[PDB]
A and B are shown apart, each in its own frame.
Chain A
Amino acid sequence: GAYKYIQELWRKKQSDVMRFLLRVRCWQYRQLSALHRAPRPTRPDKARRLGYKAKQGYVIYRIRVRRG
């Protein structure tokens, strides 16, 4: 299953691959607004293990919180 591989990728957040991904995604979400609807979950494995299913009636909202 690919979900386990994705799990270890997201556990290895410190590598150069994940550093590139987090940099790019953070820049993009920063350009976007503070409250918008994501068409798809960015981490399907994590959403699924939190309780998400690819059905009708499930929605994902990507939102930004000022830090500190």
Chain B
Amino acid sequence: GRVIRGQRKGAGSVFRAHVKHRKGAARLRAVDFAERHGYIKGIVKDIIHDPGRGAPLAKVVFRDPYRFKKRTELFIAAEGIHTGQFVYCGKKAQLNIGNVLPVGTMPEGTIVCCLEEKPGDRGKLARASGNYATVISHNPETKKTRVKLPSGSKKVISSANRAVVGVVAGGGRIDKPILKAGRAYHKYKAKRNCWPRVRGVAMNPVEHPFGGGNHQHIGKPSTIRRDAPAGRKVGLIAARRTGRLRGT
């Protein structure tokens, strides 16, 4: 047969992301002495919308504590932050919306966005529009804390990693239905070439393991095992269960 499109996606010839008009990578502040021990404050200057990402971004200006300069950083904007606000980053910054401080100091039940998965990583978790994470419990020994991720999984992280306080701005974006293929086209044009999805059953057998036949039917179980070679691993990938959910 022939190489299927899901298998062609790996080389990234025409499937690479469109990143010319993006405004930068949204990252937390780097770890240093000032925020490790005390705190520093930065001014919020602009709140920008970058292409391809639902959540807006904030441009925060800090001053270098080691030389005469001003360091500009791009954050994930939390709800309620306004331009000209003061945001404080550090170990002993008070707990209120906007500020970033380690999860080991906030009381349990705190709502957290742009969580940092490992110390120093500068923010990896709960950074999509309207998402957040919640501190569950602390372990004073071994320096670990338990958090609940937006997918519902509970994960244990080191308490020495920073995290923004609040919930990511731009919630409820999925509420509005795309009414037309035009809106869908404009949505995915700013992300990558993946939108007009063509069904496998509509294809030819040389092109897909489902294509062919005088009737449009899959012809074989849709659940494929996890250890199937690329070019065969299509359908429902190693499904524990299938069908309509009934209950939890």
The reply to whether A and B meet directly (CB within 8 Å) is no
B residues with CB within 8 A of A: none
